[PDB]
Amino acid sequence: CFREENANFNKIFLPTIYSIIFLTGIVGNGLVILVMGYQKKLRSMTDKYRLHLSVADLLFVITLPFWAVDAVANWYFGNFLCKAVHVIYTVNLYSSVWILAFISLDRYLAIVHATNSQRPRKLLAEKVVYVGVWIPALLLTIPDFIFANVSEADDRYICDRFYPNDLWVVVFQFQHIMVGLILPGIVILSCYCIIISKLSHSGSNIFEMLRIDEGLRLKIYKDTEGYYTIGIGHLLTKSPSLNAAKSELDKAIGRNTNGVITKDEAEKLFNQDVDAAVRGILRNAKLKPVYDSLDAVRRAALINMVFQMGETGVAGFTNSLRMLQQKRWDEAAVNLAKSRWYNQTPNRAKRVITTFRTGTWDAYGSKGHQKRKALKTTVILILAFFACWLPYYIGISIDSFILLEIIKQGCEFENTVHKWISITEALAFFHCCLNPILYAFLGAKFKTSAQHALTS
Amino acid sequence: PCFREENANFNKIFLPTIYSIIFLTGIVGNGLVILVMGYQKKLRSMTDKYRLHLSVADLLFVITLPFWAVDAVANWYFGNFLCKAVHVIYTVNLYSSVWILAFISLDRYLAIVHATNSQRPRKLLAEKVVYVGVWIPALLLTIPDFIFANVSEADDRYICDRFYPNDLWVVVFQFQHIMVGLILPGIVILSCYCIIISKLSHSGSNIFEMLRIDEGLRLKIYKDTEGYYTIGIGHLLTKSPSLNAAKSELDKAIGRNTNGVITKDEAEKLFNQDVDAAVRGILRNAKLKPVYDSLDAVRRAALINMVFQMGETGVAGFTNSLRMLQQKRWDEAAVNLAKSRWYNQTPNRAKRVITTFRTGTWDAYGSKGHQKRKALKTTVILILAFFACWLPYYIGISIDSFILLEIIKQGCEFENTVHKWISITEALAFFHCCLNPILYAFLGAKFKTSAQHALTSGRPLEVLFQ
Numbered sequence: 001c002f003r004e005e006n007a008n009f010n011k012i013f014l015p016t017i018y019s020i021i022f023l024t025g026i027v028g029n030g031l032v033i034l035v036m037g038y039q040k041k042l043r044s045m046t047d048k049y050r051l052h053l054s055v056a057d058l059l060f061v062i063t064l065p066f067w068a069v070d071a072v073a074n075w076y077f078g079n080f081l082c083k084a085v086h087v088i089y090t091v092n093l094y095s096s097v098w099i100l101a102f103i104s105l106d107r108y109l110a111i112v113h114a115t116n117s118q119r120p121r122k123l124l125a126e127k128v129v130y131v132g133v134w135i136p137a138l139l140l141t142i143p144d145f146i147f148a149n150v151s152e153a154d155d156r157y158i159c160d161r162f163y164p165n166d167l168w169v170v171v172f173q174f175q176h177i178m179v180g181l182i183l184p185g186i187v188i189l190s191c192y193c194i195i196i197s198k199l200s201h202s203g204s205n206i207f208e209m210l211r212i213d214e215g216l217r218l219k220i221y222k223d224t225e226g227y228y229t230i231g232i233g234h235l236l237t238k239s240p241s242l243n244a245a246k247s248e249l250d251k252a253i254g255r256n257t258n259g260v261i262t263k264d265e266a267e268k269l270f271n272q273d274v275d276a277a278v279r280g281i282l283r284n285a286k287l288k289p290v291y292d293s294l295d296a297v298r299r300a301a302l303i304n305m306v307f308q309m310g311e312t313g314v315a316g317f318t319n320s321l322r323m324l325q326q327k328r329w330d331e332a333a334v335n336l337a338k339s340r341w342y343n344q345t346p347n348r349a350k351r352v353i354t355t356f357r358t359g360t361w362d363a364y365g366s367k368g369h370q371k372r373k374a375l376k377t378t379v380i381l382i383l384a385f386f387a388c389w390l391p392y393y394i395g396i397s398i399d400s401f402i403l404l405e406i407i408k409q410g411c412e413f414e415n416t417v418h419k420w421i422s423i424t425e426a427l428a429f430f431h432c433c434l435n436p437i438l439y440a441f442l443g444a445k446f447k448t449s450a451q452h453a454l455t456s
Numbered sequence: 457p458c459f460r461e462e463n464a465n466f467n468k469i470f471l472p473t474i475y476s477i478i479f480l481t482g483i484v485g486n487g488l489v490i491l492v493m494g495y496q497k498k499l500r501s502m503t504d505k506y507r508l509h510l511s512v513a514d515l516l517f518v519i520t521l522p523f524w525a526v527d528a529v530a531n532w533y534f535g536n537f538l539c540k541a542v543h544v545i546y547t548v549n550l551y552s553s554v555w556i557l558a559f560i561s562l563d564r565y566l567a568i569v570h571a572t573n574s575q576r577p578r579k580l581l582a583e584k585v586v587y588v589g590v591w592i593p594a595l596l597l598t599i600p601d602f603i604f605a606n607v608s609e610a611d612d613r614y615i616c617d618r619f620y621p622n623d624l625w626v627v628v629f630q631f632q633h634i635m636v637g638l639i640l641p642g643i644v645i646l647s648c649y650c651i652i653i654s655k656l657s658h659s660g661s662n663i664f665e666m667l668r669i670d671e672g673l674r675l676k677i678y679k680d681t682e683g684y685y686t687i688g689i690g691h692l693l694t695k696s697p698s699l700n701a702a703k704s705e706l707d708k709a710i711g712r713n714t715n716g717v718i719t720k721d722e723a724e725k726l727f728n729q730d731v732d733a734a735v736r737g738i739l740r741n742a743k744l745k746p747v748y749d750s751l752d753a754v755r756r757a758a759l760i761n762m763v764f765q766m767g768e769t770g771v772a773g774f775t776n777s778l779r780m781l782q783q784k785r786w787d788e789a790a791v792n793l794a795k796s797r798w799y800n801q802t803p804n805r806a807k808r809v810i811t812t813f814r815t816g817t818w819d820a821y822g823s824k825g826h827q828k829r830k831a832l833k834t835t836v837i838l839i840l841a842f843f844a845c846w847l848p849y850y851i852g853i854s855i856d857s858f859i860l861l862e863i864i865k866q867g868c869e870f871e872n873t874v875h876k877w878i879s880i881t882e883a884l885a886f887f888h889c890c891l892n893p894i895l896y897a898f899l900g901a902k903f904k905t906s907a908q909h910a911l912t913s914g915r916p917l918e919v920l921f922q
């Protein structure tokens with residue numbers, strides 16, 4: 001049983017993969033570095049980390065021509081570069097994924113503890129990244145530095161890690177699997193496990209919208225003109241007695257409240273109102289046609305207005321409603337800002353109009369537009385990171401099965417495993433291009449066809 | 457060829473003896489912890505909550521030591537199932553206890569580093585995350601032992617052990633034991649304590665807490681006697697009669713229909729804006745500007761507090777006192793600040809502020825730091841001793857690692873001597889199980905009674921020498 005490098009495929013396929021990453025990798029990462037680094041000052045936290053990522057990737061990527069030459073012909077470059085390219089490899093595998101781990105910590109802080117997230121998020125991204133990521137990443141390369149050497153072999157020079165015995169191969173494989181994927185994977189998933197759980201105490205989108213706009217009372221309240229209210233703007237009945245109002249709540253809740261209720265029960269009581277509200281809209285001839293043409297988010301917008309102004313009032317916005325039914329969002333946003341509604345209750349009306357305008361929930365929340373895109377960028381990056389690496393992981397797993405005697409096959413099986421590990425690893429280095437590619441076409445509009453080069 | 461021979465002369469005598477001792481003192485010690493806290497206790501600290509989990513870990517393992525002793529002295533008489541079970545329980549214990557220690561260190565880190573708001577997260581760690589992140593992983597990681605622990609016939613007896621396909625499996629699992637067992641919990645503990653000792657001297661209070669104490673915290677809108685509407689930490693909203701107009705300003709700022717009520721969290725946000733306005737004005741006031749720049753975090757908090765009390769014009773007027781603070785001569789500046797009208801009028805608050813300018817610590821806004829320091833001392837002792845117990849065994853394993861990895865090349869005799877000292881030291885390392893109970897020994901006791909104090913009522917005038 002001997003090693004057998006294949007000419008037709010690996011000797012040609014790998015250096016090509018290596019060269020393309022090299023090429024697209026210097027340009028893409030080099031652009032991220034100069035574009036944010038040199039020129040552009042005000043930096044977003046995720047962007048701060050993506051600067052780090054692109055530095056880690058350009059460093060690795062500038063060493064790829066060695067890999068390519070090594071694969072096609074020989075290791076002409078001596079012992080010292082041998083250790084150097086190995087070190088540079090380790091540095092990349094560890095820093096890249098942990099920077100990703102740090103992007104997920106940052107998202108956790110942003111979302112889960114948004115109240116005083118700035119002091120710490122800033123601290124993470126400017127002080128802790130060097131001590132948590134870069135320095136350990138370098139310390140951990142001492143092993144590559146020690147055992148990476150060049151040997152003469154079968155008419156060429158191999159640069160590789162050479163150890164006293166086969167146990168050393170298992171020790172460093174286990175460490176690579178641990179520092180590379182299992183520990184950062186634990187942290188990424190844990191952070192996202194905490195995020196999704198924080199997002200589970202909140203109720204429906206329409207409920208959190210109106211809680212913000214109308215307010216949420218957990219205890220009955222007599223106002224100044226004698227009416228009784230609870231939950232999200234829920235009016236109990238005609239009685240002028242706290243007791244008889246408490247009688248009404250008890251009936252709608254199904255329990256002896258004594259004037260206090262829970263959030264969950266307020267959401268249920270609100271759902272019934274939202275329902276009764278939506279029913280009358282579908283009975284109003286002016287409002288129903290618009291409601292039929294709107295997406296859910298924008299229908300929440302119109303329900304909000306009914307919650308505030310009564311069905312009749314809302315039904316008087318004849319020209320704004322008409323632009324909304326026609327999907328003329330900007331016009332309609334513009335027109336609604338000129339009404340007595342806007343001039344009297346701008347805080348509310350501003351959020352509602354932004355909902356109609358965009359068809360998003362950005363107006364609620366702090367910096368909601370920015371936070372929405374930030375969450376999506378992060379998840380895309382990390383999933384794609386692991387997606388690039390996944391076929392290599394499967395390859396390495398199969399090799400592990402050989403060594404640990406989980407499977408027993410001949411050498412022809414073992415040598416096909418090793419060529420596909422060389423292939424899937426090469427294909428994995430595309431991770432170095434994702435960060436730049438996710439920055440492509442920012443602010444582009446895809447609205448031009450061959451006819452639009454010839455006409456309006 | 458080197459063969460494994462089991463040692464008797466000392467080892468069939470020494471290990472059962474040590475196992476039996478840890479067995480007896482550990483059952484009594486940990487069982488007491490479990491009964492005395494587990495049930496009676498009503499005011500329990502976080503560290504104590506953790507040391508109950510610890511004593512449960514340790515009792516589970518200690519109760520299985522009789523099997524170890526009989527195994528060492530005679531046989532494995534207990535069949536395949538128990539062979540797996542004593543392993544599982546062994547692995548559960550090695551993992552759970554060291555990680556409980558790591559959680560005791562994360563808890564300490566929150567208690568000292570973030571005392572603006574520790575209580576929710578420390579409560580969460582102690583009652584929920586300890587299960588899902590300590591116990592459950594510990595249990596899941598025993599699946600190997602359950603699978604590979606089996607009973608074998610070897611040299612005139614039954615051998616209970618983990619038997620694998622090949623020697624690479626020995627390596628894969630030992631590295632996991634060292635990692636999960638030592639190097640990951642070690643990293644966590646040492647990182648926590650790196651952050652602590654680096655910040656111990658400037659802890660105890662935030663700028664939020666400082667002013668929350670000097671100025672008070674209002675979750676509800678309050679109208680004072682001169683018509684001013686205020687919220688949170690002295691946040692002025694409006695000064696005209698409508699209350700509803702006050703609400704609308706609060707709503708614009710907070711970004712939601714408050715009805716004049718905000719959370720403690722929104723109050724800190726209003727405050728952090730206000731703090732960024734006062735700093736912005738200080739950096740444009742030429743009288744306050746260069747003094748601010750020369751000051752640490754804590755002493756800047758001390759200036760911003762004054763600006764909130766008596767406004768920017770006022771603080772720009774303590775001309776001599778500020779130069780003193782700028783020169784970094786704290787005591788005379790603190791002597792001088794106590795001679796001002798501000799001090800005679802609001803002495804309590806200004807006493808505190810000056811203490812901050814003088815010493816640069818939050819001592820005036822912080823304590824019950826006599827109990828907190830006793831909490832830190834206990835945790836450091838518990839943890840250091842734990843590692844101290846385990847250290848001779850780590851040295852043995854490291855020696856064994858050198859053999860397999862060919863970092864050294866000695867013969868069979870040398871390997872045999874290492875094998876026996878690893879058994880010795882692991883055995884001794886199990887005293888880790890009695891630390892937790894011992895540390896609770898003698899609470900309330902005073903060591904003042906000599907034989908003479910039993911023969912008499914003491915020596916004359918003991919109260920002079922207390």
Ligand SMILES: CC1(C)CN2C(CS/C(=N\C3CCCCC3)NC3CCCCC3)=CSC2=N1
Nearest residue numbers: 005067070071082085086089158159160161422
């Ligand atoms: C994990 C690792 C860094 C280790 N390694 C290896 C083993 S060394 C090596 N050459 C280079 C790998 C990359 C660093 C420089 C040496 N072998 C062969 C020799 C025959 C021709 C093809 C490559 C191949 S690809 C790979 N990736």
Ligand SMILES: CC1(C)CN2C(CS/C(=N\C3CCCCC3)NC3CCCCC3)=CSC2=N1
Nearest residue numbers: 462523524527528542543546615616617618882
């Ligand atoms: C790490 C470990 C759990 C593994 N192990 C071992 C190896 S198994 C073993 N018997 C027992 C270990 C403890 C659990 C029950 C089996 N060996 C010998 C057999 C000959 C006489 C002395 C003990 C000894 S002490 C120890 N501790």
Ligand SMILES: CCCCCCCC/C=C\CCCCCCCC(=O)O
Nearest residue numbers: 048051052055084087088091134138
């Ligand atoms: C031959 C050894 C090669 C190893 C090189 C190791 C380089 C690590 C040193 C510094 C990491 C780069 C830090 C990037 C900072 C820019 C990002 C920013 O300022 O926001």
Ligand SMILES: CCCCCCCC/C=C\CCCCCCCC(=O)O
Nearest residue numbers: 011012013015016019068069072073
């Ligand atoms: C589809 C065609 C693929 C061909 C492989 C591409 C290889 C390009 C990458 C690196 C080329 C390096 C050339 C090595 C020089 C050594 C040759 C020699 O000196 O004899």
Ligand SMILES: CCCCCCCC/C=C\CCCCCCCC(=O)O
Nearest residue numbers: 169170173174177396399400403628
């Ligand atoms: C939580 C997920 C559980 C999966 C655990 C994965 C841990 C990895 C376990 C064993 C890896 C040991 C390395 C095997 C030797 C391979 C070396 C080689 O391919 O040359």
